[PDB]
Design a protein around this ligand. Structure first.
Ligand code: SAM
Length: 263
C-alpha cells in the first residue's frame, strides 16, 4: 500500500455517526452516495446476473447496493468496507439474507482467488485511494474477476489542478480525496488489461440528482431539525450547494466506468 486510508480521520469527520445519518436522510435509507437507490437502479439497468452469480461491492457502506443487487438478481454478494461500524450496521439490517455477506477490511488488504467474481461493483468509494493505490486495486480486480467478468464503477473525478480554486482545494483536503480526470481514470483501467472499457462523463445526470436531493432537503428542513441537528442540516445544504456550483463549472465531475476481463 502506498498511502493507507486514514480510518480515524474518516470516522471523526465525513463518516461520523451524525454524518452518516445525515447522508441517509438526503440519499435515502441504506445509501451514503450519489442518487441512492435511484442512481443504483440506473447504473445497473444494463447488467445481467442470476442467482448463481457472485458480486463484490468495494466500499459497501451501509449495504444498500448489496441489498439491491441481491434483491434484483438473487446473486451471492460480498461487500467489503474499511469502516467496521458501517459493516456492523449493514449486517444488522440484512440478517434475513443468507446470500449477502459484509466484511470489515481495507480492500487493499483483501486477497481473493483468481476468477472469483462475475462482477466487481464500486460506488463513490475509490476516491479515497491514492493514485498508486487505485492502480494496485485495479490490478487486483483484474485477477479477481472471472473470464468475461465486469468491473462497474462510479466515482468522483475532477478537472486539472490548475483550475482548482481555494474552496475546491479545501474540500479535497477535508475529504482526503484523490481525484483525477475521467479519461485518465479510464486509461488507468485500460492499462490493467481491461477490455471493452467505457469511461463516461455522467456529470449531467449527477447534477440532476444533486438538484433534486437539495430541493427535497430544503423542503424538509423543519422535519430534519426534529430528528437531526442544524449543524448537520447546514453541512448537507452547504455541501450540496458547492457540489452543484462546482459541477456546473466542470470542476467536480461524476465518472462512470465499465470494463471487462477478456481472455
Ligand atoms: C461515499 S461512501 C459510499 C458507500 C457505498 N458504496 C454507497 O454507495 O452508499 C465511500 C465508502 O468507501 C469506504 N472506503 C474507503 N476506503 C476504503 C478501503 N480502502 N477499502 C474498503 N472501503 C473503503 C468508506 O468507508 C465508505 O463507506
Amino acid at each position: 500500500i502506498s498511502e493507507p486510508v486514514d480510518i480515524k480521520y474518516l470516522e471523526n469527520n465525513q463518516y461520523s455517526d451524525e454524518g452518516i445519518k445525515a447522508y441517509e436522510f438526503i440519499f435515502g435509507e441504506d445509501y451514503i452516495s450519489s442518487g441512492g437507490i435511484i442512481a443504483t437502479t440506473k447504473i445497473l439497468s444494463d447488467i445481467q446476473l442470476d442467482a448463481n452469480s457472485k458480486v463484490l461491492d468495494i466500499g459497501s457502506g451501509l449495504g444498500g447496493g448489496c441489498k439491491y443487487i441481491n434483491e434484483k438478481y438473487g446473486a451471492h454478494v460480498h461487500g467489503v468496507d474499511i469502516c467496521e461500524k458501517m459493516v456492523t450496521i449493514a449486517k444488522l439490517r440484512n440478517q434475513d439474507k443468507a446470500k449477502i455477506e459484509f466484511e470489515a477490511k481495507d480492500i487493499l488488504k483483501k486477497d481473493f482467488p483468481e476468477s472469483t467474481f462475475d462482477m466487481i461493483y464500486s460506488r463513490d468509494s475509490i476516491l479515497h485511494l491514492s493514485y498508486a493505490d487505485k492502480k494496485m486495486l485495479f490490478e487486483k480486480c483484474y485477477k479477481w474477476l472471472k473470464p468475461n467478468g465486469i468491473l462497474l464503477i462510479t466515482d468522483y473525478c475532477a478537472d486539472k489542478i490548475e483550475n482548482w480554486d481555494e474552496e475546491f482545494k479545501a474540500y479535497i483536503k477535508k475529504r482526503k480525496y484523490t481525484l483525477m480526470p475521467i479519461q485518465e481514470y479510464g486509461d488507468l483501467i485500460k492499462s490493467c488489461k481491461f477490455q471493452n472499457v467505457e469511461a463516461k462523463d455522467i456529470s449531467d445526470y449527477w447534477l440532476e440528482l444533486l438538484q433534486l436531493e437539495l430541493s427535497k432537503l430544503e423542503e424538509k428542513k423543519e422535519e430534519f431539525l426534529k430528528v437531526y441537528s442544524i449543524k448537520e442540516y447546514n453541512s448537507l445544504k452547504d455541501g450540496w450547494t458547492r457540489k452543484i456550483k462546482d459541477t456546473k463549472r466542470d470542476l467536480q465531475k461524476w465518472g462512470y466506468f465499465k470494463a471487462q476481463k477478456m481472455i
